[PDB]
Amino acid sequence: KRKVVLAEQGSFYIGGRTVTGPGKFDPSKPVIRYSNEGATFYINQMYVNFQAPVRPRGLPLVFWHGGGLTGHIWESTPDGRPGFQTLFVQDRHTVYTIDQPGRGRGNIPTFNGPFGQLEEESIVNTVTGNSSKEGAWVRDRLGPAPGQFFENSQFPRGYEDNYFKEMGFSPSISSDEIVDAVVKLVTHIGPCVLVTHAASGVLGMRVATHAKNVRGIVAYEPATSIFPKGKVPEIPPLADKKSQIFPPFEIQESYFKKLAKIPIQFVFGDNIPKNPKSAYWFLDWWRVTRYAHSLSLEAINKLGGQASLLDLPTAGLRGNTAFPFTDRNNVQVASLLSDFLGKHGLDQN
Amino acid sequence: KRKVVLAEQGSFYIGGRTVTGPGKFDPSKPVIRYSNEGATFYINQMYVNFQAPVRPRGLPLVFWHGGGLTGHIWESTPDGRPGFQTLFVQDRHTVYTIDQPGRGRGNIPTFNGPFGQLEEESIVNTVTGNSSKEGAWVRDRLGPAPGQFFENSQFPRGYEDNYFKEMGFSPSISSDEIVDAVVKLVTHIGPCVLVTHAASGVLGMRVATHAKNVRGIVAYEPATSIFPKGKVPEIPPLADKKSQIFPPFEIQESYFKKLAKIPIQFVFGDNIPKNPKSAYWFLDWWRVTRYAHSLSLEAINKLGGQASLLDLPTAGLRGNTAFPFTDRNNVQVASLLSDFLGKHGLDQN
Numbered sequence: 295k296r297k298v299v300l301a302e303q304g305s306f307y308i309g310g311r312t313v314t315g316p317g318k319f320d321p322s323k324p325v326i327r328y329s330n331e332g333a334t335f336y337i338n339q340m341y342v343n344f345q346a347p348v349r350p351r352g353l354p355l356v357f358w359h360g361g362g363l364t365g366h367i368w369e370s371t372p373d374g375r376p377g378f379q380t381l382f383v384q385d386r387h388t389v390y391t392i393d394q395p396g397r398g399r400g401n402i403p404t405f406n407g408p409f410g411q412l413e414e415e416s417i418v419n420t421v422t423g424n425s426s427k428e429g430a431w432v433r434d435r436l437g438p439a440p441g442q443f444f445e446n447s448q449f450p451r452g453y454e455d456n457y458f459k460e461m462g463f464s465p466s467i468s469s470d471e472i473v474d475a476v477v478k479l480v481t482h483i484g485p486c487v488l489v490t491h492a493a494s495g496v497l498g499m500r501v502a503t504h505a506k507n508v509r510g511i512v513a514y515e516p517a518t519s520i521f522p523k524g525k526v527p528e529i530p531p532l533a534d535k536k537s538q539i540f541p542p543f544e545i546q547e548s549y550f551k552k553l554a555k556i557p558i559q560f561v562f563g564d565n566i567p568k569n570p571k572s573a574y575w576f577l578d579w580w581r582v583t584r585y586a587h588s589l590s591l592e593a594i595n596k597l598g599g600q601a602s603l604l605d606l607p608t609a610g611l612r613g614n615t616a617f618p619f620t621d622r623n624n625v626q627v628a629s630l631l632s633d634f635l636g637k638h639g640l641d642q643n
Numbered sequence: 644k645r646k647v648v649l650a651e652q653g654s655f656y657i658g659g660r661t662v663t664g665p666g667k668f669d670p671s672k673p674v675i676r677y678s679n680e681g682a683t684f685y686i687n688q689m690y691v692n693f694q695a696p697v698r699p700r701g702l703p704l705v706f707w708h709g710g711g712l713t714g715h716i717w718e719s720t721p722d723g724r725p726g727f728q729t730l731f732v733q734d735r736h737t738v739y740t741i742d743q744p745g746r747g748r749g750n751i752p753t754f755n756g757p758f759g760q761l762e763e764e765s766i767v768n769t770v771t772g773n774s775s776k777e778g779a780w781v782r783d784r785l786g787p788a789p790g791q792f793f794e795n796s797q798f799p800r801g802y803e804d805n806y807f808k809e810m811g812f813s814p815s816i817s818s819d820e821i822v823d824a825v826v827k828l829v830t831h832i833g834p835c836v837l838v839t840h841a842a843s844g845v846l847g848m849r850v851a852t853h854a855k856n857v858r859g860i861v862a863y864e865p866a867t868s869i870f871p872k873g874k875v876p877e878i879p880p881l882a883d884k885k886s887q888i889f890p891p892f893e894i895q896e897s898y899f900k901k902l903a904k905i906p907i908q909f910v911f912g913d914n915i916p917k918n919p920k921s922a923y924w925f926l927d928w929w930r931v932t933r934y935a936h937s938l939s940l941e942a943i944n945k946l947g948g949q950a951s952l953l954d955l956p957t958a959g960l961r962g963n964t965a966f967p968f969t970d971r972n973n974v975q976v977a978s979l980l981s982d983f984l985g986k987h988g989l990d991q992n
């Protein structure tokens with residue numbers, strides 16, 4: 295269960311750019327306190343960790359955390375059980391886990407001055423946003439309200455502190471620069487599979503349209519849908535009749551068509567309502583967001599694709615949250631991912 | 644050289660507190676955009692990773708990154724060679740690596756509003772500080788000026804971008820709360836050895852005085868010296884006759900004397916001048932900082948301690964930077980750490 299044999303492991307930085315302050319650096323002058331004068335800063339680089347089994351079988355997997363998270367979520371569950379990193383090294387895949395730019399060991403671009411500001415340039419906004427425990431509780435469908443759990447819960451109850459401690463803010467790095475870093479990683483790795491989550495769902499779809507080395511996508515509970523430009527289908531408002539889901543991302547149809555060349559699976563957990571739910575905003579948000587994703591997958595399929603929606607309850611798994619890969623049944627979730635990889639030969643050399 | 648057999652691996656969050664916003668949370672109202680209303684935020688928690696070998700021998704090692712760094716620096720060198728994590732799991736030690744609060748996967752305490760501000764409470768400062776590539780080049784003694792290498796340098800040339808990309812800012816989390824998180828980890832772990840670096844040198848000394856489970860300290864190029872309260876010796880200014888080293892940390896003698904109860908080694912690399920060097924501020928800074936540490940160790944030994952200063956050149960290792968554990972000879976550096984552990988029985992069950 296817990297044992298793991300690695301041919302090699304390591305980590306590295308990839309992607310990013312540099313920005314500079316004014317003037318010249320004088321090594322005779324006091325270097326502390328730190329100044330922007332004569333300064334070169336590396337910004338928006340990404341952290342990558344890799345673990346390779348002895349004699350891997352099939353393509354490397356790239357696990358890409360959701361919004362406000364880090365590669366921790368693939369390492370261990372909140373109660374300390376093995377994460378997908380261990381499970382899939384054991385399943386003989388090389389496993390990459392990333393901390394995207396702006397998260398965890400990824401770069402947070404700030405300097406000497408107000409957060410995110412390099413002299414007169416605003417690299418990222420000084421004003422931040424961040425979810426609360428309460429917001430995240432309902433966003434991840436632990437239960438309909440903070441403190442409550444759905445009946446069928448696979449959440450590791452008792453480990454709420456561990457769970458919410460893994461979450462944090464993201465600075466306003468452009469999504470283009472996040473996608474760019476992962477495109478560079480995919481170039482470095484070669485043919486691979488992207489395994490995405492929540493906020494990284496739409497970013498992974500974008501990466502695949504720029505990087506033919508992406509041979510497959512599995513997206514756990516993706517947060518933003520994607521459509522060809524000008525072809526977003528009618529999507530209803532939420533039951534409060536005022537709110538909307540996240541504005542779907544629109545890409546040129548020439549790029550969207552690249553999504554029809556690779557197997558794509560979206561995975562949803564449990565307790566997404568079938569009918570409008572005006573008393574529970576994020577439950578209703580998930581209902582309409584999942585609907586929008588079903589239309590996105592249909593558009594990919596109308597273009598020759600191999601896109602599918604897996605609702606874990608239809609596969610016999612009840613009670614999953616929006617983090618199925620750290621829930622109590624995450625070994626059974628992993629088995630369904632192994633099934634997808636096997637079906638498309640992504641577990642074969 | 645690279646194969647590793649883990650009995651188990653994983654990661655978890657530990658330490659920290661909570662802060663709360665005003666008001667209450669209504670699950671029926673839009674959760675996004677995120678708001679401080681009814682919000683609970685987990686802040687200042689620390690990320691911990693562990694890798695355990697089969698049949699461990701001796702005490703677990705806790706590797707604690709220097710200032711503006713993360714546990715990455717123990718995983719791999721900038722040119723991709725094994726870091727101390729791999730080397731010491733191979734040396735049959737369980738190995739913990741942390742991202743301290745405010746760094747990497749540790750929490751960065753910010754909310755909805757100007758960086759670090761929770762309504763009118765400033766949790767961390769909105770104005771940040773951060774080294775440049777140029778300041779870090781001379782701080783780490785790659786050479787005397789940015790872009791120039793000492794002839795004898797053990798730095799992995801050609802991987803400068805990779806190296807500097809690992810560095811970043813730290814918010815103004817109080818050092819007390821950083822020490823608190825590690826004390827809690829040490830309580831959770833049991834008897835262990837701290838391996839510290841640069842800015843975590845003084846913090847690790849402080850942890851030892853609060854945590855009898857710390858059975859030894861090895862500090863690579865510690866940045867701040869520590870003395871009993873009111874017994875700071877005379878320390879000269881820098882060669883410019885205007886700058887000072889970091890103000891020594893002072894602790895109550897009853898706490899200081901706990902440092903005499905365990906083996907302590909400070910490790911310094913090469914190219915620290917013996918004589919005043921007015922032209923190169925950080926070289927001179929290291930000359931006086933090393934001298935202050937020599938007096939700190941002497942004060943520990945006058946309390947019955949066993950505190951030593953290891954200059955790597957005297958061991959036949961030339962050219963090390965302020966990150967000896969990621970330099971080209973880091974295997975030989977690791978051998979000297981294994982020697983220390985073995986001399987003191989810390990590699991024995």
Ligand SMILES: CCOc1nc(NC)nc(NC(=O)NS(=O)(=O)c2ccccc2C(=O)OC)n1
Pocket residue numbers: 360361362363423433491492493494517518540541675676677
């Ligand atoms: C502050 C403006 O909010 C905002 N607007 C847009 N559309 C313009 N997109 C984003 N990005 C996200 O995906 N949000 S989220 O918080 O990471 C998220 C939401 C829902 C479900 C899951 C997540 C997630 O990844 O949690 C694991 N955020």
Ligand SMILES: CCOc1nc(NC)nc(NC(=O)NS(=O)(=O)c2ccccc2C(=O)OC)n1
Pocket residue numbers: 326327328709710711712772774782840841842843866867889890
């Ligand atoms: C505004 C600064 O005044 C101030 N005083 C104190 N005294 C406790 N400590 C700090 N912290 C730092 O600046 N650490 S440092 O930059 O990362 C660093 C400096 C020198 C040598 C090494 C490091 C380091 O850790 O290299 C990885 N700063």
